[PDB]
Each structure stands twice: as C-alpha cells, then as structure tokens.
Amino acid sequence: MYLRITNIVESSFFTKFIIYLIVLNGITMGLETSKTFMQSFGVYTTLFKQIVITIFTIEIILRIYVHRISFFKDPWSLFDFFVVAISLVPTILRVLRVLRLFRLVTAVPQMRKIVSALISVIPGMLSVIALMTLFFYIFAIMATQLFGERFPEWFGTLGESFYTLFQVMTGESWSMGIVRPLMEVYPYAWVFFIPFIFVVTFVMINLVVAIIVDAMAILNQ
Amino acid sequence: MYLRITNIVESSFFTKFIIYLIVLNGITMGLETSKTFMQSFGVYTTLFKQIVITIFTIEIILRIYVHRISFFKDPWSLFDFFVVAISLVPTILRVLRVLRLFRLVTAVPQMRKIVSALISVIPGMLSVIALMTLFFYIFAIMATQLFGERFPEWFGTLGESFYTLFQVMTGESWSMGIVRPLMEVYPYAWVFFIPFIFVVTFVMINLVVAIIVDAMAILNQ
Amino acid sequence: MYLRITNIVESSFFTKFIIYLIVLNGITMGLETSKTFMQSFGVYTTLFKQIVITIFTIEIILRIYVHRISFFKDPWSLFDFFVVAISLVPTILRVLRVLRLFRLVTAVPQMRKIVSALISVIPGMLSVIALMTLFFYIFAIMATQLFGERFPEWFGTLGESFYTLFQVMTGESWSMGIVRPLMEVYPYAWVFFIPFIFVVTFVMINLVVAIIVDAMAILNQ
Amino acid sequence: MYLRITNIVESSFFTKFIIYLIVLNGITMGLETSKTFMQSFGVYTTLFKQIVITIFTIEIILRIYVHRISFFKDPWSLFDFFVVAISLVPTILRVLRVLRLFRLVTAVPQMRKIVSALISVIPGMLSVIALMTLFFYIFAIMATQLFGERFPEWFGTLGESFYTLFQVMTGESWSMGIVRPLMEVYPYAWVFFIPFIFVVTFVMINLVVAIIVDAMAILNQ
Ligand SMILES: CCCCCCCCCCCCCC(=O)OC[C@H](COP(=O)(O)OCC[N+](C)(C)C)OC(=O)CCCCCCCCCCCCC
Ligand SMILES: CCCCCCCCCCCCCC(=O)OC[C@H](COP(=O)(O)OCC[N+](C)(C)C)OC(=O)CCCCCCCCCCCCC
Ligand SMILES: CCCCCCCCCCCCCC(=O)OC[C@H](COP(=O)(O)OCC[N+](C)(C)C)OC(=O)CCCCCCCCCCCCC
Ligand SMILES: CCCCCCCCCCCCCC(=O)OC[C@H](COP(=O)(O)OCC[N+](C)(C)C)OC(=O)CCCCCCCCCCCCC
Ligand SMILES: CCCCCCCCCCCCCC(=O)OC[C@H](COP(=O)(O)OCC[N+](C)(C)C)OC(=O)CCCCCCCCCCCCC
Ligand SMILES: CCCCCCCCCCCCCC(=O)OC[C@H](COP(=O)(O)OCC[N+](C)(C)C)OC(=O)CCCCCCCCCCCCC
Ligand code: NA
Ligand code: NA
C-alpha cells in the first residue's frame, strides 16, 4: 500500500493534475473581482473552490504521509502545507488565500530553480542589509527629532520617518515633496538629506556589485 | 531569368535603392505632422507615398519569388512582408504604417546584428518573466480586492491594479500618489507595498545580473 | 597592571558588554521620540543615559591608555573617541549624539569588514567625483546666470542651482517640475538640460562600471 | 629661439601657471552671480578677466606656434583654441564662456585620462544609439499623430513628442503626468506606452551590459 500510494504521489501525473487544478483555481480567483461575474455564477464558483480545496487538502495529507520528517524539513512542502492550511480556515484572511497561486511555483521545476537561485544570494548580502537597517534606524531617529514637530505627517513618529527615508532612498519625490517644503522652514535640511542620498545610493550600488561578483565567481572557476 | 532576377534582388544596389526609398519615406512620414506642410504639398506627398509603396510591394513580390520557402521561414523578411502588407490596405491603422521605418533596421547589416544580439538574450530570462507575471497577477488580485472599493481609479478592476503595480515597480509616484493616499484610509497598506517594492526591485536586479552573466560567459571561454 | 588592563580591554567580554550597552542605548534612543514614553519614564531614561555614557567614557579612557599612538592612528577608535567626546558636551547637537549607534558597526567584526570594503572603492573613483563636481560647478553657474532672474527659487543663487542640478541628475521631477515651467518662459532650456541629463547619466553609468571592474579584478587574478 | 620657447611652453611650470589662472578665473566666474559682490568689485573683476584672457590668448598663440599641424589635429588643443576664441568675441554667448573651466580638465593629466577612457566607449554603442534614435523617431511620429490633437502640449508637434518620449524613458511622471490623463480620453494608450516602456528600458539595460563587457574584455586577456 505504501508502494502504491508513493508511486501515485511522486508520479508525474498526480503533480500534473494538481497543476491543472492550480491553474483553473488561479483563473477562478482572477474572475471573482468582477461584480458582474460573481452575480452570474457565485454558486458555481463557490462549488469549484470547495472541490479544489478538498483535493488540495487530501493531496497535502498524502504528501505529509509519504514523507513525514521530510515534509516539515522541506521548505517547498512547508510552504504548500502553510498555504493550504491558511486557505482552510473560514470566517480579512480571504486576501492571503491568493498566495496559493504561488504553489504553481512549487510544482513547476523551472520556477523552483529560479527561486532557489534567487534565495542563494541573500547569504551574500545579509550583512549589507543589516548595516542598511541600522543606518536607516539612525537617520530615522534624527529625522523624527528634527522635523517631527513641524512636519508630523512625514516625521512625527519613528515609523513615518522610516517610511520617508525609504522613499527618499527610492528617489521618488525626495526634493519637491520632502526636502524643498522642509527648506521652506528648515533651510539647512539638505545637510541631512544630500549626505543621506549620497550614502544610501552608494550603498545600494555596492550591494548590486557584490551580488554580481558572488553570482559570477561560481562560474569563473 | 531566375539567374538575372536573383542577381538583381541579392545585389547590393537593389537593397541600397530600397534603403534610399526607406530614408526618403521616413522623412516624408516625419513631415506630415505639420498642418502647414500638409496644406502646402498634400498632393506631392500622397504621390510620393503611392510610388514608394508600389516599389516596395514589387520588391516584396520579387523577394518572395526568389526564396519562397525561405521568405516565410525568415523573421526579417516575415516582418518586411507583414509591414508592407499592413501598409497596403486602405480605409486607425494609419499610425501603424510608421512601423515600416523599422525596415531600415531590416536592410542595414549592423542594425540586424544589434537586434539579433538583443533577441538572443530573452531565452535566458523567459523564466524570470513568467515568475514576475505570476507575481504581478497574484498581488494585482490582492490589490483589487483590498483597495478596489475605496480607490476604484487605481484598483477597481484587475487591469487598473496591474497598471498600478507596474507603475509602483517603476517607482514613479508610488508613495505620494498611491501609498500615502491609501494610508489616508487604509493605514496598513505599506505591509502590502513595501514588501512588494522590495520583492519586485530585488527580482529586477537579479534579472539584470543574470543577463550580464549570460552575455559574458559567451566570451569568457 | 598593564598586563591585566590590556587583557581586560582586548578581552572578548569587555567588547561584548559595551556591545550590549550599545544595543540597550540604541533602544533607549529609539524610545525617546514618543511623547507618551518620555512622560512615563523621563527620569529612568536620563539615569540610564548617564550611566551608559559614564561606562563608555571610562572605556574610551582605558582604550586610549592601552594604545596611545594607535588610538589616534586608528580610524575606528578615532571615530569612537570623536562620537563619545561629542556626546559628552551638554547645552542642537543632541541630534548628532545618535551617531553613537554607528559604534555598533565599530564593535562588530562583520560590519567592520563591510565598511572597509566600501571605503576601499573610493580611491578608484575620486577622479570621476572630481570631474563630476567640476561639471556640476560649470553647469550650475550657467543655470544661475540663465534662469536665476525668472526662476530665483531654483537658480537665483549658485547653491540652489547646484541643488536643482543634483535633483535633475537624480531624475526626480526634472521635466514637469523644472524643465517644462522653464520652457513656459525660456523655450530653449532643453538645449541645456537634455545634454545635461545625457552627460550626467552617462558619467554615472561609467562610474558604476569602473567600480565593477575594480572590485572584480581583485578576484580574477 | 624655437628651442627656448618650446622648452617654456612644454615646461611643467607654464602649464602650472595657466592652471592657477584657470582656478582663479573659475573662482571669479563663481563669484559674479552675487549681485552684492558685483556691486562691490565690478571693476576689479573685469580687470582680472581682461588680464587672464590676455594671458590665455598669448598662451594659445605660443602653443599654436610650437605645434602648428598638431594643434589642429589634437582634440584637446582644438577644444582649448575653440573655448579661448569663443571667449574672445564681445557683444547671450556670455554663458558659454564658462566652458573655459573645462580647460582645467585639459591641463590636468588625470582628468584627461578619465575623459579619454569615457570617449573610448562610444564606438561600442554608436549602433545602439542609432537604433534608439530611430525607435524614438518612429514612436514620436506615432504619438504626435495619435495624441497631438487632444494633448498638443505633449504631442502637438514632433519635437514635443520626442521630449515626452525621452521623459517617459527616464520614467519621470510617465503614468500620473502623461499616461493616466491620456487614458482620461484615450483609454487604450497603454498599448502604446507599456510596450514603449518595456522596450526602451530593455534596450537601455542591454546598452549598459554591452558597455560592461567592452570595458572588461580589455582586461580579461
Ligand atoms: C533579512 C532579509 C530581508 C530584508 C528585507 C527588509 C529589510 C528592512 C527591514 C526593516 C525593519 C524595520 C521595519 C520598520 O522599522 O518599519 C516601520 C514602518 C512602520 O510605519 P508605521 O509607524 O506603522 O505607520 C503607521 C502609522 N500609524 C500606526 C499611526 C497608522 O514601516 C516602514 O515604513 C518600512 C519601510 C521600509 C524600511 C526600510 C528599512 C531599511 C531597509 C534597507 C533594505 C536594503 C536597502 C538597500
Ligand atoms: C516592434 C515591436 C515588436 C514586434 C514583433 C517582434 C518580433 C519580431 C522581431 C523579428 C526580429 C528578428 C528575430 C531574430 O533576429 O532572431 C534571432 C535570434 C538571435 O539568434 P542567435 O541566438 O544568435 O541564434 C541562435 C540559433 N542557434 C542556437 C541555432 C544558433 O534568435 C532568437 O530569436 C531566439 C528566440 C527568442 C525569441 C523571443 C523573441 C520575442 C520578441 C517579442 C517582442 C515583443 C515586444 C513587446
Ligand atoms: C514574453 C517576453 C516578453 C514579455 C514582456 C511582457 C511581460 C508582461 C506580460 C503581461 C501579461 C498580462 C497583461 C495584463 O494583464 O494587462 C492588463 C492591463 C489592462 O488594463 P485595462 O483593464 O484594459 O485598462 C483599461 C480600462 N478600461 C477597459 C475600462 C478602459 O494592461 C496593463 O496594465 C499592462 C501593465 C504591465 C503589466 C506588467 C505584468 C508583469 C510584467 C513583468 C515584466 C518583467 C518585469 C521585471
Ligand atoms: C557617517 C558619515 C561619514 C562620517 C565620516 C566618515 C569617515 C570616517 C569613517 C572611518 C571608517 C574606517 C575607515 C576605514 O576602514 O578605512 C580602510 C580602507 C580600506 O582598507 P583596504 O583598502 O582594504 O586597505 C588598503 C591599505 N593598504 C593598501 C596599505 C593595504 O582604507 C581606506 O580608507 C582607503 C582610503 C579611502 C579614503 C576615502 C574615505 C572617505 C570617506 C568620506 C565619507 C563622507 C560621506 C559623505
Ligand atoms: C570626495 C568623496 C565624497 C564626495 C561626495 C560629495 C561630492 C560632491 C561635493 C560637492 C561640493 C560642493 C557642495 C556645494 O556646492 O553645495 C552647495 C549647495 C548649498 O545650497 P545653499 O545655497 O546653501 O541653499 C541654502 C539657501 N539659503 C542659504 C538662502 C538658505 O549644497 C547642495 O545643493 C549640494 C547638492 C549636491 C551637490 C552635487 C555636486 C556634484 C556631486 C557629484 C557626485 C558624483 C555624482 C555621480
Ligand atoms: C552620437 C553620440 C551621442 C548621442 C547622444 C544624443 C542621441 C539622441 C540624438 C537625438 C537626435 C534628434 C533630436 C531631436 O529630435 O530633438 C527634438 C526636440 C526639439 O523640441 P522642440 O520641438 O524644439 O521644442 C520647442 C517648441 N518650440 C519650438 C515651439 C518652442 O528636442 C528634444 O526633445 C530632445 C529630447 C531627447 C531626444 C531623444 C532621442 C533618442 C535618444 C536615445 C539616446 C540613447 C537612449 C538609451
Ligand atoms: Na518621480
Ligand atoms: Na525615478
């Protein structure tokens, strides 16, 4: 029995059928935004969602059976179990059920290759991320103390300062929307932001080049 | 006769004459925006367009003759045939007739080299493009469900959500124009967009570095 | 006595205790933005700041003792001494005391590695920075003379021209916010800014690629 | 006499004295924006400008003497002669006299190295620039025909369309400022701009990577 059930679970066709269920359910989720289409086929849509979630849950049961230790030590099946379990509980969280469509990435081998390649790079940049978060923390405290009183919408609390600094980093309306109105009152805020812009852009560039060399040295040898 | 006609078609000078026709027709298309110049020489312009399209169509006939199987299996001549045929039909589509100027790229060898080099890179990034389209699909459904009611202009339907997410990806007015007005009502939309910005920017950077390594390894060996 | 005191200063645990003091003081600085929390525990916060600054100052004394010549010839301890001394003087400068949190970078070995790696790149780009500053100087003088009278907010003095040019370089509202309102009066300002944008973007790209090759050649050999 | 005059012109100190004149004249040009400083020392400033331009012109005469054929076949001295001659003619052109400060780049060896390195890259990208200019031409004609009537400020003539397309390429207010107001009337303009944005960004990325490989292969061998 274990032989038959594992030869079914690890068979190509079981994964293919759940892929087709994933694709049809993704189209289903894409169609429920329409008020008109919901009015047309609410009952059919809900029925389809019930049957596909039943098949996905029984699939998760079979998979957690065939590999019990491996299921909770494999991030892909961990993610599948988490998304299925989240989709299971009814009432808010309805929005996060759309993350089940990421299971299309779980099933497809090429998408899995891409995502593993993407994840393997973070170990090379955790350090720079930590430095950047500390630098953001420091300059956000400075911005809140300096401009929080006169411009509470942008720096009144620490969080809005973190937000404004992330925005200035992105270089989106940093001068016209933030710095120039600050200079309308605090005429020497550029001593804060021009060094901030220089520093944060410089660090982002260095992060990119470090990523380049780490992804290239695995090929140069 | 086949000898003479192919020695004329594949001759340097036939392609050169059609190049000069392409250049003169490009100037012609560049001049028809002027209301004043149209008033001045409408009849001369229309006459020139008729004669050049006749020469281009007879050229396409001769080329489709000398290489019949090759014509429909060669993307350059496929594009030339398509643009000439589109320009042929009269009445809207008048705007797309300007794409005939891309035939200057078809004729010139260096432009052909550049375009082939550009196309040869997409096989290395189709996977990342597919992942990005799926990710855009998922977060666009989420954005439509969350913000479609209170901000229908940006997320009322799925398409406007795809548009707003592409824009936020470009980092054009993502905070002042979208996120901050959302926080005016939904105070916790940054939990959606800050991860979205981080993720989408990160994926774009990885796409660029993968393109770099694929275009460099063809030289390192 | 010198043996014991240096075996204490260069011991792992003294640096670890000052790290924990750094972290607790960073949380403390992060909490003083709250008007509510200040009202709650002003006396406790001030007491903690006094005791931690006393420990940091005695630490700086011990370190400047164990290595006197090295202290003023080591940029890390130079920075630590500078930030501690700045934090020492009471009354403005209260904002700059937050830079003591950068001492977390001083203590942590990995952060030190990152920062040294970042600094080692500037010798490869001082030349390009000098050229860019000269180019900014020249075009800022030009912008002040041309547009300073009709648009004094952006080019009335040299400094506001430097600012506007840095902004245009960043590509933030360069056309809608600057160039188009200029063309509302000076219709041929794009002859100034389009070459400026082309040139400044081109130089920034070349700076990035030069940084790439300098950081890669240290690995290729 | 030729021996003495060339040993003076090509001597280190003649170039150093003209460098000091360049630096002092650059400060002079930097000070004339001030209405107050002009009121203070107009006569002194004009006198200094007269004497430095006399020394620069006699220097250009001596240099064009020592190397007559080389002077008009050397781009650096060509630029020096051009800027000095432009500065010579009085009356508009007063703004372009500031380009004499680029002669600081001419004199300094390191700046010359940087600029030659920058120029040596364009031969590798003239082709891509030509393709991009043709693509801009085509889509600008399309934009003028489509949106010139309803939005003449952005596409009424060909030039304003070239400008708007360059701006959209830069990704500055492309959606909120251009595309969305167009969709207020022409609801299907994104079929024009989303492909335009994709294409133009993609080509710019490929230009950058080609520059990288051309500047790296000169080192890999
Ligand atoms: C470890 C690997 C993955 C790392 C990816 C993430 C790295 C950054 C982690 C940041 C940790 C700190 C998060 C944080 O401080 O968030 C604070 C704000 C909260 O805003 P909040 O005050 O809640 O606004 C609501 C106002 N309310 C309550 C009255 C309604 O929320 C924000 O505004 C967040 C904005 C972005 C913060 C940027 C922090 C530094 C990012 C550096 C990343 C690398 C850049 C090259
Ligand atoms: C004006 C807007 C776009 C209008 C339609 C665009 C499509 C038509 C353009 C045709 C242009 C000519 C195509 C072409 O040159 O293809 C050659 C490339 C490069 O060759 P290469 O990789 O050197 O040769 C490999 C062949 N091998 C392995 C047997 C030695 O070999 C390949 O083609 C590799 C396959 C890549 C296919 C991906 C092409 C997708 C283009 C879609 C453009 C949509 C724009 C939004
Ligand atoms: C295969 C090789 C070449 C690949 C290049 C293209 C890759 C992306 C394909 C996207 C396929 C899905 C297209 C799509 O969903 O378009 C939906 C919207 C339509 O807006 P729509 O709802 O029609 O607005 C009109 C409103 N109405 C009807 C009432 C007047 O139209 C849009 O808003 C389109 C906006 C861009 C969509 C971005 C989708 C993901 C792009 C990821 C590309 C890589 C990024 C690094
Ligand atoms: C918070 C805002 C900034 C506050 C002030 C910033 C300045 C103080 C920061 C001190 C941090 C520690 C400095 C440091 O680690 O320098 C080490 C680097 C890298 O060493 P490395 O290149 O590995 O060693 C080469 C030595 N050799 C050839 C004999 C083997 O060796 C070098 O230093 C090479 C020389 C480069 C000097 C350029 C540094 C300019 C920094 C200016 C920052 C201004 C921000 C706007
Ligand atoms: C050496 C290694 C590290 C190098 C990093 C820094 C490199 C740039 C150094 C710039 C030196 C010149 C600084 C400068 O000219 O600042 C002038 C403006 C001052 O504005 P200001 O006139 O005080 O405005 C206040 C108005 N008021 C007095 C009536 C209230 O202040 C500003 O607006 C500054 C804006 C940025 C200036 C950009 C100058 C060229 C930067 C090129 C950097 C590389 C780019 C790829
Ligand atoms: C060869 C090596 C160096 C190459 C660098 C330059 C490459 C681009 C050359 C462009 C040649 C065509 C220039 C052109 O068409 O300019 C037309 C517009 C003129 O605006 P205009 O109609 O005069 O506006 C005034 C209105 N009026 C008369 C009534 C007052 O003037 C503009 O709007 C210019 C805006 C930029 C045009 C962008 C053309 C394609 C650039 C592609 C560069 C590479 C991008 C990756
Ligand atoms: Na912007
Ligand atoms: Na931008």
Numbering used by the authors:
A (entry chain A), B (entry chain A), C (entry chain A), D (entry chain A): 1001 to 1091, 1097 to 1226
Recite the paper's sentences.
The L176GNK mutant showed only a half reduction of current in 40 mM extracellular calcium condition. MD simulation indicates that water molecules are also more likely to be present in the extra cavity of L176G and L176A mutants (z = 0 Å), which is also consistent with the electron density of the crystal structure of the L176G mutants. Small-side-chain mutation of Leu176 creates extra cavities where the original leucine side chains were.
Our crystal structures of NavAb mutants show that the mutations increasing the hydrophilicity of the inner vestibule of the pore domain enable a divalent cation to stack on the ion pathway.
